[PDB]
Design an enzyme around this catalytic site. Structure first.
Site, PDB file in Angstrom:
ATOM      1  N   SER A 121      10.477 -24.821  63.178  1.00  0.00           N
ATOM      2  CA  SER A 121      10.211 -25.295  64.547  1.00  0.00           C
ATOM      3  C   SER A 121      11.301 -24.726  65.441  1.00  0.00           C
ATOM      4  O   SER A 121      12.480 -24.943  65.185  1.00  0.00           O
ATOM      5  CB  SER A 121      10.301 -26.817  64.579  1.00  0.00           C
ATOM      6  OG  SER A 121       9.090 -27.356  64.023  1.00  0.00           O
ATOM      7  N   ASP A 125       4.252 -25.607  73.517  1.00  0.00           N
ATOM      8  CA  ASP A 125       5.290 -26.433  72.883  1.00  0.00           C
ATOM      9  C   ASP A 125       6.667 -25.738  73.094  1.00  0.00           C
ATOM     10  O   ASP A 125       7.273 -25.212  72.152  1.00  0.00           O
ATOM     11  CB  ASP A 125       4.951 -26.571  71.377  1.00  0.00           C
ATOM     12  CG  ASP A 125       5.646 -27.728  70.700  1.00  0.00           C
ATOM     13  OD1 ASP A 125       6.545 -28.363  71.284  1.00  0.00           O
ATOM     14  OD2 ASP A 125       5.266 -28.057  69.542  1.00  0.00           O
ATOM     15  N   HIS A 137       8.513 -30.664  70.497  1.00  0.00           N
ATOM     16  CA  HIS A 137       8.455 -31.638  69.404  1.00  0.00           C
ATOM     17  C   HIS A 137       9.774 -31.741  68.711  1.00  0.00           C
ATOM     18  O   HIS A 137      10.036 -32.705  67.993  1.00  0.00           O
ATOM     19  CB  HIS A 137       7.279 -31.361  68.441  1.00  0.00           C
ATOM     20  CG  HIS A 137       7.483 -30.212  67.515  1.00  0.00           C
ATOM     21  ND1 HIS A 137       6.820 -29.012  67.667  1.00  0.00           N
ATOM     22  CD2 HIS A 137       8.204 -30.108  66.380  1.00  0.00           C
ATOM     23  CE1 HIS A 137       7.155 -28.208  66.669  1.00  0.00           C
ATOM     24  NE2 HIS A 137       8.007 -28.844  65.890  1.00  0.00           N
TER      25      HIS A 137
END
Lengths: 200, 199
Positions: free
Chosen positions: B155, B77, B39
């Site tokens: 992230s 992810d 992402h």
């Protein structure tokens, strides 16, 4: 496992199946034919040299010129290298490549827990053309992947992974930073590619 | 846990394994190679830049060009990012990426109860590295859960054990005893990463 030992005599089997690139390893799979990684052969061209089973500067089975490079179309890090049969510099058995080397034979298979050996020239810089043998267990075998816990360094790129009977179970391509090492397992598809490209 | 502290020295290990995107984190896993989340990488392309271990003022381990983006085929992810070995802007140890950074080593494993740290950039203001600590809540397949405070900038953060070994990569939190979620490095994911490290 971390059990890496210097090879004292590189002019006997299984060591006679191993070849040295400038900073990587490969091995003999048939007449005038060697296997290494794509990430190795991408830096070589037709006419570049390989040395058969050198032991530092103490002796080797000859110096040979590359005549053909063929990469596995699939994702796996496998490249076939053919050499001119007549050496640039002879080995002790004369100028013929095939007189001075021993190809490896595929094992029937491999399985987790069995003990393997990775043989090659681990040091990119130091210990030039010094052959080592590094032992450890197989961790997993899944499709075209074989994983084993044996200490390796970057010059081990292209090393054969042999079982306890010196039969071929894989070709080394990577290791973890500072427990596992990763090899390509010879699936029927990869074996078919190699067989089609052994010098006739 | 909510124990988040500014990293005093960003030019020592383990912080020399961390790199900055615009408002996200990643970390070094091998030669010319970093991990971050899908992402994150979906907003980047080949030719964009990352900065190695930037400090609050102006100092860093170099600025590097992205040369490959390889997403993990699977639910997790995780994205592999390779960079040009030669810095766009040199680090203190010269142009070579690999001379300026320090890759992480995998932990043997991780278990509920042990304390971890999540290192990254939780505030997008100047890049300012933070370290956030907390206990591991559970480990199940490719999922590692830990109660450590994170923001969206985390992230792609490495999640490290007490010995600074890698136990997962951060990808999400809940919106302090809230839980955060990382990808745990299962054999299958390790294999993919090893196949895609620059060689």
């Amino acid at each position: 496992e971390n059990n890496v030992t210097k090879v004292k005599d590189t002019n006997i089997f299984p060591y006679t199946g191993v070849v040295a690139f400038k900073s990587a390893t490969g091995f003999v799979v048939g007449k005038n034919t060697i296997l290494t990684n794509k990430h190795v052969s991408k830096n070589y061209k037709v006419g570049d040299r390989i040395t058969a089973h050198p032991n530092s500067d103490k002796g080797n089975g000859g110096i040979y010129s590359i005549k053909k490079i063929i990469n596995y179309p699939g994702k796996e890090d496998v490249s076939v290298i053919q050499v001119e049969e007549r050496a640039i510099e002879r080995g002790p058995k004369g100028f013929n490549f095939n007189d001075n080397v021993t190809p490896f034979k595929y094992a029937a298979g491999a399985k987790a827990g069995e003990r393997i050996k990775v043989i090659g020239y681990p040091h990119p810089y130091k210990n030039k053309y010094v052959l080592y043998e590094s032992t450890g267990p197989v961790m997993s075998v899944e499709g075209s992947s074989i994983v084993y816990s044996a200490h390796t360094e970057s010059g081990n790129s292209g090393s054969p992974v042999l079982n306890s009977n010196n039969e071929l179970v894989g070709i080394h391509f990577a290791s973890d930073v500072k427990r596992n090492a990763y090899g390509v397992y010879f699936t029927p598809e990869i074996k078919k590619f190699i067989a089609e490209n052994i010098d006739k």
